[PDB]
């Protein structure tokens, strides 16, 4: 068991449960999203750490500069473990580390910067499956009489719309289907009922299979060699749609 703040980052909205095994850290993109997340959370088991701005690339940046970064210190401190050789999983303050970013591309980019931080400084957190990715909603279907439904894809949107109409429900063509363009646009209630309620949230657990293959990919994508990255993007962007086919 570990003490919660009521010696940690100022932006950390810690949980109440003193058991790491039962605790969860939501690393959130933006002060706005983090603010509403702080309100909709379960304050017992869920803590919020809002990260502001693009995270520093630890692959590119010198080590001393990374340690001066206010946002990295927030993560390293709030996780408690330590980094590199001084890493100690025993001091992990949250056994669930959920990265929650916007569905847009800059959200995707921030996650790749965080996954890089974790893989390089605190790799065992990934290997032992403590790192997760929350999937935010893309749409909110606001039925005229029925309860609202949330969708996490264009496909699911079309599916819930079709089913509902077939079931005799109806929607306004003005208000209609609210489309989320980021977590910042969501209020406390919406975030709970889509990303933080453990009975309905869609989490993805980051797994690490081939460590050597991962090591090279991180260096190619996040490294200082532009040439290697430029040829990689031109080589593989052509086939991103077919990675899971």
């Amino acid at each position: 068991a570990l003490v919660r703040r009521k010696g940690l980052p100022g932006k950390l909205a810690d949980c109440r449960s003193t058991d790491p095994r039962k605790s969860e850290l939501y690393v959130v993109e933006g002060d706005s999203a983090g603010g509403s997340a702080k309100s909709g959370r379960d304050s017992m088991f869920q803590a919020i750490l809002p990260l502001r701005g693009k995270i520093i690339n630890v692959e590119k940046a010198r080590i001393d500069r990374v340690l001066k970064n206010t946002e990295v210190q927030a993560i390293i401190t709030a996780l408690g473990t330590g980094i590199h050789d001084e890493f100690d999983i025993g001091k992990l303050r949250y056994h669930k580390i959920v990265l929650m970013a916007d569905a847009d591309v800059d959200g995707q980019h921030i996650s790749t910067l965080l996954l890089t931080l974790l893989f390089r400084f605190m790799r065992p957190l990934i290997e032992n499956g403590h790192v997760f990715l929350a999937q935010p909603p893309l749409y909110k279907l606001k039925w005229q009489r029925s309860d609202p439904e949330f969708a996490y894809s264009d496909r699911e949107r079309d599916g819930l719309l079709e089913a509902g109409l077939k079931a005799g429900k109806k929607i306004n063509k003005e208000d209609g289907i609210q489309r989320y363009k980021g977590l910042g646009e969501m209020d406390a209630k919406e975030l709970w009922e889509t990303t933080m309620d453990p009975s309905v949230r869609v989490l993805r657990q980051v797994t690490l299979d081939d460590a050597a293959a991962a090591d090279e990919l991180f260096s190619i994508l996040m490294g200082e060699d532009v040439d290697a990255r430029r040829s990689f993007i031109t080589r593989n962007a052509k086939d991103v749609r077919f990675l899971d086919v």
Binding site: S32, G184, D187
Partner: peptide
């Protein structure tokens, strides 16, 4: 959206 709270949580 986020219009704050009765506490110190500022609005978005």
């Amino acid at each position: 959206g986020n219009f704050g709270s009765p506490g110190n949580d500022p609005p978005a």
